[PDB]
């Protein structure tokens, strides 16, 4: 399980100024000369979104301020002039490997296809939930793969589970053994069936696509979230 240490967790600046953050991961991300490195930009209420795949190419929409550089272990995301709409949270991703791992983030404070995610809600430890993600604007048998990723309150991002065009599906070893990701092609959704919950599966859940591209394993596009509560 390659682990990503993010540096520094939180920073303030000015408008105008440079911001570099790093990544540094517990094993190297590099494959056939390329470096399986994502970042992702995240205000507060919304998904994450990806602005930088394979270390250093930019996603389509992205302003020419965000860079990103390096290789193996050591990557860096550089703001040249921070503007207004730069203040949010930063995380490095690795798709070199699953389980795909994502940094513990840098808040960074100054001075068509959709989702939706249903199913949510309080549910008693030990209970289980059902997680539905309806795709609209797309076939979901065009995505090269869905993914769920939870975001625990307050804390990292985890990848938990994708399944394929093909049906292969793949999951955390977190979770393994609780989890069961399936797809209805005719309804054009996919779903996460959850039992046994524990209180540290409280968390926000998103459902992702992956891309057909540079490894597959970023996620370009995502919904909006639902808040799953295990409590007494």
């Known amino acids: 399980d390659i682990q990503l240490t993010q540096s520094p967790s939180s920073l303030s600046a000015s408008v105008g100024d440079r911001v570099t953050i790093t990544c540094r991961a517990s094993?190297?991300?590099?494959?056939?000369?390329?470096?399986?490195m994502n970042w992702y930009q995240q205000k507060p209420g919304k998904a994450p979104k990806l602005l930088i795949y394979?270390?250093?190419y930019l996603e389509s929409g992205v302003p020419s301020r965000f860079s990103g550089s390096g290789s193996g272990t050591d990557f860096t995301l550089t703001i040249s002039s921070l503007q207004p709409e730069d203040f949010a949270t930063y995380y490095c991703?690795?798709?070199?490997?699953?389980?795909?791992?994502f940094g513990c983030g840098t808040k960074v404070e100054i001075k068509e296809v959709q989702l939706v995610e249903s199913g949510g809600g309080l549910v008693q430890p030990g209970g289980s939930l059902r997680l539905s993600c309806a795709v609209s604007?797309?076939?979901?048998?065009?995505?090269?793969?869905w993914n769920w990723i939870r975001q625990a309150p307050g804390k990292c991002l985890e990848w938990v589970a994708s399944?394929?065009?093909?049906?292969?599906?793949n999951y955390n070893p977190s979770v393994k053994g609780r989890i069961t990701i399936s797809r209805d092609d005719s309804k054009n959704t996919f779903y996460l069936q959850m039992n046994s919950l524990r209180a540290e599966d409280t968390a926000v859940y998103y459902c992702?696509?992956?891309?057909?591209?540079?490894?597959?394993?970023?996620?370009?596009?995502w919904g909006q979230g639902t808040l799953v509560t295990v409590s007494s």
């Open positions: 992702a696509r992956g891309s057909h591209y540079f490894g597959h394993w970023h996620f370009a596009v």
């Open positions: 604007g797309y076939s979901i048998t065009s995505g090269y793969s």
């Open positions: 399944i394929t065009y093909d049906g292969s599906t």
């Open positions: 094993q190297s991300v590099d494959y056939d000369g390329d470096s399986y």
């Open positions: 394979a270390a250093s």
């Open positions: 991703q690795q798709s070199h490997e699953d389980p795909y791992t």
